[PDB]
Design a protein around this ligand. Sequence first.
Ligand SMILES: CCCCCCCCCCCCCCCCCC(=O)OC[C@H](COP(=O)(O)OCCN)OC(=O)CCCCCCCCCCCCCCCCC
Lengths: 467, 100, 54, 504
Amino acid sequence: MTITPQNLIALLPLLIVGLTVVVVMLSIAWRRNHFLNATLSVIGLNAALVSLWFVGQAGAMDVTPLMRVDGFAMLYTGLVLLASLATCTFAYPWLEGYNDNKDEFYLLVLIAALGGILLANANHLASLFLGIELISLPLFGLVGYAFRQKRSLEASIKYTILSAAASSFLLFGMALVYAQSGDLSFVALGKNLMLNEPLLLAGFGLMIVGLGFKLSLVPFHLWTPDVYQGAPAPVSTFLATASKIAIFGVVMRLFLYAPVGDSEAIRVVLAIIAFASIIFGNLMALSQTNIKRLLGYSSISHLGYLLVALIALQTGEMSMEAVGVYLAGYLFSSLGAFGVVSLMSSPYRGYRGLFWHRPILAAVMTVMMLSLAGIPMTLGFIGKFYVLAVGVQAHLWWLVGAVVVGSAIGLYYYLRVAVSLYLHAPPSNWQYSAGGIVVLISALLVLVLGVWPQPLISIVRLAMPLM
Amino acid sequence: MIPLQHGLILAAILFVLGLTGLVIRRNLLFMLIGLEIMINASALAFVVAGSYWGQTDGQVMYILAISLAAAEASIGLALLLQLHRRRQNLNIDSVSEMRG
Amino acid sequence: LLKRDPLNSMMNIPAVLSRFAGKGLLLSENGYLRWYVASMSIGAVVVLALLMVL
Amino acid sequence: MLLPWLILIPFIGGFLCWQTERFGVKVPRWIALITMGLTLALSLQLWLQGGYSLTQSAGIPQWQSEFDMPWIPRFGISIHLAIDGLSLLMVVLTGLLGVLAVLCSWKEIEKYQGFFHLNLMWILGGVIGVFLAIDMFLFFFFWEMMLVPMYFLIALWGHKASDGKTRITAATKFFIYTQASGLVMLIAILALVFVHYNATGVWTFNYEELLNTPMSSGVEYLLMLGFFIAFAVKMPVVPLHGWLPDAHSQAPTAGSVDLAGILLKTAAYGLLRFSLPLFPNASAEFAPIAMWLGVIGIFYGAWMAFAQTDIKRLIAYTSVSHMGFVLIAIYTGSQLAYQGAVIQMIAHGLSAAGLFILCGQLYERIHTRDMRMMGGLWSKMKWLPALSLFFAVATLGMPGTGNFVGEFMILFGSFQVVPVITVISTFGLVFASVYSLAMLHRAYFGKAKSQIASQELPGMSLRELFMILLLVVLLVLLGFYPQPILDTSHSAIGNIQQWFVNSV
Ligand SMILES: CCCCCCCCCCCCCCCCCC(=O)OC[C@H](COP(=O)(O)OCCN)OC(=O)CCCCCCCCCCCCCCCCC
């Protein structure tokens, strides 16, 4: 099998992001200009976003032994491209205060977006591993971007060591799986099988360890508040949105296309991990005074909810659209919240009563805090409703009980932050205005698709892969 | 003629020895050395898996594994040089100011 | 005897349980990297054992 | 077709109060009065146009006016509104109490009154939508979207004498209780929808389609249990009642949030509309547990209300006891008990509205709410002690007020069904008289126990006196002539009772 021009037509976002990586590299090497390389990165990401239309006009095809492109890959590519664009938009006013070079940030963001796109298009074990590492390594760079600051260096060292250990775990499980089956494709895991054999189960368990590190799942979740607090706020935005979206998309692709998802033991241990993730992530954010650690535990809880939606994929046919809707709502809410945090942290030097000096940012922050709690008139409620419907349909009662309990605890701390925005405390540049517009459209999209969610349902259901 | 189980057991032994050196050692350089040991052990398991089935996929996965190993070693070495420059010691347990 | 609203405290018991459990779980986030790697290894052993027993 | 507008014009009015706030501080109160007057006018127009007095019972469903619009066609979800006699009565009561809540906060010249009024009519539109909507997802959406402005009003605009931490704690307790109960109600709704899909094969969230759903015993019991847990937190039913006195005490000192927010009990309407017809057999099996919970609620609320040193907390526990009476009324399967329940909810809303307004004005006069710091206040004000005496007389079940009519028809139907629960509830009425006398004697009679009660206090103005006298006249007319109210709700109550007792 060889590469046809239609394959490169379907390969448009990957080629565009690689080309703009090379172009940003050459422009940085020509002259250190922050605005020019920032505009080049935004132009390349938007070019990939509008080349998604030509990818959709092409069709669904298995472009490589590695890649497969369909509506699934299109939707997750669009999500990670939106996350990368918002990361650049929030990063530029933060980078205006950086005394050191400000040009490698957009290069690393573009390379991580390339890794996310390759994770969205992955249909092979090698593609899955390469996409995980291509997400992780620019995140090593971006988390420790302000290495003069102590906490950024702490988070960089912790993330690098822990993610190298998780990559080693995942690669060893991959090697055990390949020793069992003999093919690394996503559709030939256990085709020779008596679906339960200890070597394949152990390999899938080690890949579960690696992916659960990458998805902040209990008990591989201890890095999340530390890395989220230490990293810069646009880096926290990217790590909360794009990494989670891409890794969970490739996790669902692996657990849908493989026959190993029908095994009861993996479903049982995933239910245990989802229960522990929801309860632990919600309970750990009760007494959190810092917004970044609170949002890290929030990410743990929301990935637990996504796990609950993923467990019932083999029984019901509506789990995938539930995960898509929840991930769209979670992306928008995390973008709004971390964008308010980034705009309050910009420019880089080195939230109580926010309404009395910055009222629009307080409005966006309290809307996103309502959205993350699963409260109606917001998109997070639509996602939680989808997760609960999927759990009820396949009769997972422990999981939906955990969802209700965790939603109550999240209600407590999210609404505490929301009222603290309106208590009594004791910029001037169009890039900051662009960030404010981005978080405002995020809040407006959350409210509108909470009131009227049906167009998002139509777009998500039209993103239908090969059943 | 050579059992696959013995090669996988060898790779598992090297992996758990690398993790032992990762956990019990406090200097950051030995954590990076242990990380190199685990990534070489996973690559070794991939080569045994590819040699059992007679395919080049294990060797290609080994190539990707050691490309990742080299890139992560360079990144961790730069981060360790930063830690030694701004702290003047390689104690990894003093990196604990972020808690709770 | 009832002016303290005993049923209100009976239903406020799980709030106290949630607070105690959250404060207990927050002690695991001590900020040490070697503990994080050890906890990852512990979780790997736990999930592998749960996969072997079923 | 007027029902979408009946829900919408509070929301448009609240948006106009927010927008026209820049025109002046004294502008949004007038806008709120105009839009609640219009909402009450359309509710009265539906009352005069529906012809509820000469309506028979054609079986469930039987709606006087309905509206359909597709909302989420993937799940078969529609903005589906329907009005009959019971829904119309609660909508008219909602408009009346919203007008009273807007009039009760007329003396605020604060800087941010526009958002206060916006949240107030958001609450009012949410509770109107709860009464009107029969689609399960839309009913749940109104049920939980009226919750956020309640939280924000209690937390930010609440009792100024208390600290911010106490108001935040009370608001968060109320929100956690009500939204967790909403979530388990959503679990019950989703499981009912999936059972209906497995039986038939069509995505229906409609109330009329879910009635013809075959369920085994045990599953229907759990769905009924989730519905009852939601309607037991929102009633309140003990021990799921701790949010109510905390939310009432840390409510805004004007008293508008109590009238608009909590004094219309959507839980008993939800039991009559949804818990009883959708789960007849499960509710018939649950009737002893619910009725004994009502008994415990009546006596527990009386024992609290005697032992509170705070008057607002006392009235909250009066609400607990009266809704325990209503809970006993719901699970009897009797025409007379259901009609008495409807009369009791309306009369309790009016009487507790009068009590809360008079308590708020008393706090405005004397700057304290502790009942140990006041006494002998009959000779200190002009109108307030006599009107509070009338409303405390009304709340103990006195003839000439609608509370006696509602409670006695409840007890007549209950004694037709179960005698022991009836006699224990009548002794609960004795306890109710006991706490009403205790509140009256510790509030307005005796000698002055402090210096603020030892001086002559200013009298009430014309607007508050007019609204209190309107409440007094309405309670007297309900007590002496409840026949139009009984004839208005005779068809829907008959349909619900026939569906409840004909399927068992
Ligand atoms: C009929 C029973 C069976 C069915 C139940 C269905 C569920 C709905 C009905 C029950 C709801 C119970 C809610 C209980 C908590 C209410 C809120 C509360 O009490 O908050 C207190 C406190 C916040 O107040 P504050 O003083 O500011 O905080 C302390 C400072 N650190 O709060 C905190 O500090 C932390 C609050 C965390 C969130 C609340 C706790 C939720 C735990 C899960 C409960 C699920 C239901 C369990 C079964 C019922 C109870 C036995």
